[PDB]
Amino acid sequence: AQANEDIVVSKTSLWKEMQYNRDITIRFKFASSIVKSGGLGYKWSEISFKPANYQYTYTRDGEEVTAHTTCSVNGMNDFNFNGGSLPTDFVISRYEVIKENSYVYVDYWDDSQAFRNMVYVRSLAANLNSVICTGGDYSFALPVGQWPVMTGGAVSLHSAGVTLSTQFTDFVSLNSLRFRFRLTVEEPSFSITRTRVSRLYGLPAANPNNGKEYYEVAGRFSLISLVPSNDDYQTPITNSVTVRQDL
Amino acid sequence: AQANEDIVVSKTSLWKEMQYNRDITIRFKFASSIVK
Amino acid sequence: INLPITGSMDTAYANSTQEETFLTSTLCLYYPTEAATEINDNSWKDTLSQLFLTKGWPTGSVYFKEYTDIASFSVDPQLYCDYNVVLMKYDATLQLDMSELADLILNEWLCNPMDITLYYYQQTDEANKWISMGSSCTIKVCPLNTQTLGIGCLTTDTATFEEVATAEKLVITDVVDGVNHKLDVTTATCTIRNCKKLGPRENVAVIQVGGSDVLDITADPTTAPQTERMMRINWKKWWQVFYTVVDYVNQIIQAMSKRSRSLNSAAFYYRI
Amino acid sequence: INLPITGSMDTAYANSTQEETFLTSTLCLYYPTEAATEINDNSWKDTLSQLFLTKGWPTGSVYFKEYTDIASFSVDPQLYCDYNVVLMKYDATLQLDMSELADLILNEWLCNPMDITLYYYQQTDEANKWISMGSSCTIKVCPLNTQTLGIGCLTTDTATFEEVATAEKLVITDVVDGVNHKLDVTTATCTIRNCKKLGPRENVAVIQVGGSDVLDITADPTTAPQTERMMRINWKKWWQVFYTVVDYVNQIIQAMSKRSRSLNSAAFYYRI
Amino acid sequence: QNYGINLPITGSMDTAYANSTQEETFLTSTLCLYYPTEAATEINDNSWKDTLSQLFLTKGWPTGSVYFKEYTDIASFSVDPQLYCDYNVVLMKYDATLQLDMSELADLILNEWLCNPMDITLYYYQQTDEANKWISMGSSCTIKVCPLNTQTLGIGCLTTDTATFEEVATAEKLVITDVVDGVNHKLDVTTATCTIRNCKKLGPRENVAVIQVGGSDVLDITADPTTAPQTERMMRINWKKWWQVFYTVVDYVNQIIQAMSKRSR
Ligand SMILES: *[C@@H]1O[C@H](CO)[C@@H](O)[C@H](O)[C@H]1NC(C)=O
Ligand SMILES: *[C@@H]1O[C@H](CO)[C@@H](O)[C@H](O)[C@H]1NC(C)=O
Ligand SMILES: *[C@@H]1O[C@H](CO)[C@@H](O)[C@H](O)[C@H]1NC(C)=O
Ligand SMILES: [Ca+2]
Ligand SMILES: [Ca+2]
Ligand SMILES: [Ca+2]
Ligand SMILES: [Ca+2]
Ligand SMILES: [Ca+2]
Ligand SMILES: [Ca+2]
Ligand SMILES: [Ca+2]
Ligand SMILES: [Ca+2]
Ligand SMILES: [Ca+2]
C-alpha cells in the first residue's frame, strides 16, 4: 500500500465513505504576548502565550502540498516574581510556564483531498514522533541599570490523542485535525540571570522558538470521512471577518 | 413515550433522519461591560 | 514446453556423456584468499589445470576466481560458468551469513525491485522473501494494521521499528506473510529486492571446508534438508583440499547438472 | 481403551482441522531473556499476538513465558498448554544440559519418589532412569555386589563414592541395570526421583536457535535420532526468529500432535 | 490398547460376580492422609505415625503404603494443593469465617480441572459455559474485574482507572471466580504474588475424600445455587479429640476407599 493511499469503504449515489492514510510534516511555532506596565519600565504586566498560525509549503513524493498549522497551549501554570514595591525594582506580575499538567494543541490542515470537504470523521488515529522544545533568551530591556535575561528551558513533547478542530483566522476557516501533545520536563532549566531565581523546570513564554523558524515533527494519520461522490464539490474556506466591532 | 427519547424516522445507506425530544435546564447568565 | 515426453524401459543405456561434457563445458572454482596465502605459489592455477587435464577437462576450460571473504562474495555474486564449485570456510560467527549465501546461490531467484518510500510491501506465499545486498545493510520493519498504522511501532519514529539486520552485507528476510510492512533501509549503501524462490540451481556446488553440516537453506525450521550438492570436508591444509577436489571432480559434476531456465550471469533474474 | 479400532480405505479425506484447532487450542512460547533484552520493546507480545491473528490463532490463545536460563527452566519445567514451543540457545558448555532438557520435555515420564537413606534402589530396564532437579545437585553413587557390600567404594565413606554430577540443576542419571546403588545427594536443595520413560510428548516442539544438531534424546549411544518436533535455526537477531516461527507455525503444529495420556502441568507424572 | 479414542464396550447379565479386589488394591496402592497441625499439637507424640501405620497393617495397608502429609491451615493448603497418591484423604476443620475457603478447596480438589494460562495485561477474557471459571492461587490475591460492552468500553467501570473496578476478592490465598458468561471482562490482579488460570471443570476426581471434622454440611461445591449436592466422598464427623478421629478413619478406611475410585486420567 502507498504511503498516501485513498480508498473507498462504501459508496451510495451522492455520498461515499472515503478512507485516507497519509504522511504529514507538522511545522508549527509558538508565539508570545508581552505586555509591559507603565511608569518607568521596571514592571511587566503579562508574559503569556498567543495561538499562532503558520502556513508553509512542503514537498510530498513528487507533489507540492501547501499546509496551514496553528499552535496553542492549555493548562499552563502562572508564576510571578516581585522583588519590591518601589518603581525601581524589576517585577513581573504574571508569566506563563509549561509542565506535565499542561498540554500543547496543534491544529493541522493541507490542500490535499483529505481536507477538501471534511466535516465528518471516524476511525481516527495517528502515529507521531516526539520532539524537544527548547526556550530561548529574552533580554528584559530595563530603562536603566542591569539587563536580566530569561534564558533556558527545555521540555519534550510526546504524542497523545487526536481529535478534530476548526482553525479560525481573518483569511481562511479550516476544518482541521487536532493533534495533542503532553510534556515531560527535560534537564535544561530556565533561569532569570542577575536575579534570585534558577533551577526550575519548564519552558518560558517569552522566546519559546529559540530563534527558530518553526518546530518540525513528522507524522501519519488515518481516517474515514464523508465526501460527495462527485469529485467537484467545494466547502467554503476563505473568510471576511468583522467580529468585535464593540472592541 | 419517554422524556428523553431517540427515534429514527427514516434511514438511508449512510445518513438517517432521527427525532430528538428532550428536557433541558437552561442555566444562563448575563455579563456587563463598564468603561470609565 | 507444455507438451509431454514419452519413452520406454526397454531401450538401452547410452555411453558416458562424461569426457564430452567436460570438453564442451567450463569449470570454475571459488577459493578464499587464505588458500593462496597459505600456498605462497604463483603457478598453482596452471598446476591444477595440468592436473585436471588428466581427468579430461582441457586446458582452457578450468578457471579460478578469488574472493577475499564470504561476505565480500555475498555482495552481488556473479556466477557465469557452466559448472561452479565454491569452497566455504566454517565459522560459528558467520553461520547465518554463509547459510544465506547458500540459499542465494544454490537456489534460483526471480527478483523485482522495491521502492520503500512510495510503497509498502508484503510477502504473498512461503517462497517470497526480501534479499538485500550492499556494503552495510541495516533493515528495520514496522508491521501494519488494517488502517495503515503501526503495531508495536510508530510509522515515523524509526527507533521504534524492529531491527532484523545490523550492518550486514547480504540479508535474506522473511516476515509474516499477509500483512503490510513499512521498511527502513540504508538505501544509499544497499539495494533490496522482492524475490521469489523458484526451482534450484543445479550448476553450483558448495563445499564446507570445516565444521559439521549447519546450512539450513529452507527458511522454515521444520525441514533443515541436506541437498546432494552441499558437501563437507575436514581440513588442515589447502593443497590437500584442491587435490581431493581434483581427484573427486567426477562425483561432484555427477551431483551437479546443467541449467534449464535461461542464460544468466547474475545470481538472480530481474523482471522489474 | 483396550478395544480395537476398524476402518477402511474408501472413506473420504475430511476437511482441514486447521483453522478450528487454532480457535479451540492454545499456543505457548518459551523464549530466553536474551530475546527480550535484544528487542528492548514493551509491546512485542501484543505485536506477535496481532500477527498470529492473521494466521488464525485468536487473541486469547497465544501466550509467552520468559525463562532466564536453560537450567532455571530445567528446574521443574511447568508446561500447561495445548501447544508448547521452546526456543533454545546453543552453548557447547551446556550441550548435555540442553540435551537433558529435551530428553525430559519431549518425552513423557512416570516418576516415583526415592528415599536414599532408608532404601537402596536399582534400574530394571533401559528406560528406568533417575532424574534429579534442584538448584545445585551433586550426586554420588556406590554400586553394590550380591552380598550388600561395596564395589570400588565403601558403604560409609562418602568420599569413595563415584561422582556423576557437580552442582547441576537438572541431571538424568542412567546406571547399570541389575545392581543396587547407594546414593548420596544434596537433598536439602535437590529432589531425585526414579522415573520410567513412556511414549513421547507430542505437545512440545524444541527449536535450537543456534549451532549444529547435538541433541541425543536417547541415552543409548547407538540411535542419535532427530525427531520431528526438534528444529534448528541459524540466527543473528531474534525478530527474524519470531517472524519465522509465526510464518511457519502451521508446519510446527502439523509436526506436533495433542497429547493422549492425561491433563498434566508438570513434565512428568507422579504415582508414588 | 488404543489411547485417545472412546469405543463401545459390550457386556452381559449372566456373568458371575468376580472376587473381591479389596485386600489386593491395598497392597498394590498407596494411601495419603492430610491432617492439620492442630492434631499433632493436641497429640504431642513423635511415634503416632508409626502407630497408625502398624494399625493400618491389620486392615491390610502395609508399612510403606500409608503416608501422612501435614498442613498448617486450610488456606496454606489451598495454595497449590499437590494431591499425588493412589488414595487421598483430607481432614478439614470447620470455621464459619472460612466456609467459602473450605468450599473452594473442596471444589478444587474433589473435581478435576483442565487449566489453561492467562495474561491479564494483553487479553480480556470471558466465560463460555457454566463450567469455565478462573482459579487464582497464591499468598495474597486481590482481584478486580470490569465487564465490557460490545464496543470494548466499560460497564460501571473505566478501562484505565483501576479503582472503578469491582472487587470480588480481597487478600485471599485461593479464589474461584465465576462471572457472567458472554461479556469480555478486563482484570486487575496482584500477579506479583498470585497466578490465575482459566480452568474448565471436567468430571470429578474420585481419588480424594474430604472429611469435615466439625460442623454441619456447608460445602456448596456447585457454583449454580440450585444443586447444593453432597457426594459420597464428602464426609462429616463430630469431634472432641483427634485420636478418636484417627482411630475412626482407620477402623472405617475400607468404606472410605469403597467410596473412592482411582482416577481415569
Ligand atoms: C559405447 O561403449 C562400447 C564399449 O566400449 C563401445 O563398443 C561402443 O562403440 C560405444 N558407443 C559408441 C556409440 O561408440
Ligand atoms: C470439505 O472441503 C470441500 C473443499 O473445500 C468443501 O467444498 C466442503 O464444503 C467441505 N466440507 C466440510 C464439511 O467442511
Ligand atoms: C473367589 O472366591 C471363592 C470363595 O471364597 C473362592 O473359592 C475362589 O477361589 C475365589 N477365586 C479365585 C480366583 O481365587
Ligand atoms: Ca547476513
Ligand atoms: Ca517496536
Ligand atoms: Ca514469508
Ligand atoms: Ca545437566
Ligand atoms: Ca571409588
Ligand atoms: Ca540404565
Ligand atoms: Ca478462598
Ligand atoms: Ca465501579
Ligand atoms: Ca460463569
JSON list of N, CA and C in Angstrom, two decimals, chain E residues 16 33-34 165 180 210 226 238 243:
[
{"chain": "E", "resi": 16, "resn": "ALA", "atom": "N", "xyz": [-20.83, -64.02, 36.27]},
{"chain": "E", "resi": 16, "resn": "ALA", "atom": "CA", "xyz": [-20.78, -64.16, 37.72]},
{"chain": "E", "resi": 16, "resn": "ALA", "atom": "C", "xyz": [-19.98, -63.03, 38.35]},
{"chain": "E", "resi": 33, "resn": "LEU", "atom": "N", "xyz": [-2.91, -39.43, 54.02]},
{"chain": "E", "resi": 33, "resn": "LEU", "atom": "CA", "xyz": [-3.71, -38.54, 54.84]},
{"chain": "E", "resi": 33, "resn": "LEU", "atom": "C", "xyz": [-3.12, -37.13, 54.85]},
{"chain": "E", "resi": 34, "resn": "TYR", "atom": "N", "xyz": [-4.02, -36.15, 54.91]},
{"chain": "E", "resi": 34, "resn": "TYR", "atom": "CA", "xyz": [-3.69, -34.73, 55.03]},
{"chain": "E", "resi": 34, "resn": "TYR", "atom": "C", "xyz": [-4.38, -34.20, 56.28]},
{"chain": "E", "resi": 165, "resn": "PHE", "atom": "N", "xyz": [-12.95, -0.40, 39.24]},
{"chain": "E", "resi": 165, "resn": "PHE", "atom": "CA", "xyz": [-13.25, -1.81, 39.07]},
{"chain": "E", "resi": 165, "resn": "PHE", "atom": "C", "xyz": [-13.97, -2.36, 40.29]},
{"chain": "E", "resi": 180, "resn": "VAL", "atom": "N", "xyz": [-20.32, -13.38, 34.76]},
{"chain": "E", "resi": 180, "resn": "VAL", "atom": "CA", "xyz": [-21.40, -13.56, 33.81]},
{"chain": "E", "resi": 180, "resn": "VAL", "atom": "C", "xyz": [-20.82, -14.05, 32.48]},
{"chain": "E", "resi": 210, "resn": "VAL", "atom": "N", "xyz": [-12.79, -35.72, 51.25]},
{"chain": "E", "resi": 210, "resn": "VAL", "atom": "CA", "xyz": [-12.80, -34.69, 52.28]},
{"chain": "E", "resi": 210, "resn": "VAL", "atom": "C", "xyz": [-13.62, -35.19, 53.46]},
{"chain": "E", "resi": 226, "resn": "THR", "atom": "N", "xyz": [-28.50, -24.10, 42.85]},
{"chain": "E", "resi": 226, "resn": "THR", "atom": "CA", "xyz": [-29.71, -24.91, 42.71]},
{"chain": "E", "resi": 226, "resn": "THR", "atom": "C", "xyz": [-29.47, -26.35, 43.14]},
{"chain": "E", "resi": 238, "resn": "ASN", "atom": "N", "xyz": [-18.21, -35.62, 64.13]},
{"chain": "E", "resi": 238, "resn": "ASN", "atom": "CA", "xyz": [-18.21, -34.80, 65.33]},
{"chain": "E", "resi": 238, "resn": "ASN", "atom": "C", "xyz": [-17.01, -35.20, 66.17]},
{"chain": "E", "resi": 243, "resn": "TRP", "atom": "N", "xyz": [-7.38, -38.29, 68.40]},
{"chain": "E", "resi": 243, "resn": "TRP", "atom": "CA", "xyz": [-7.09, -39.72, 68.40]},
{"chain": "E", "resi": 243, "resn": "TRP", "atom": "C", "xyz": [-8.32, -40.53, 68.03]}
]
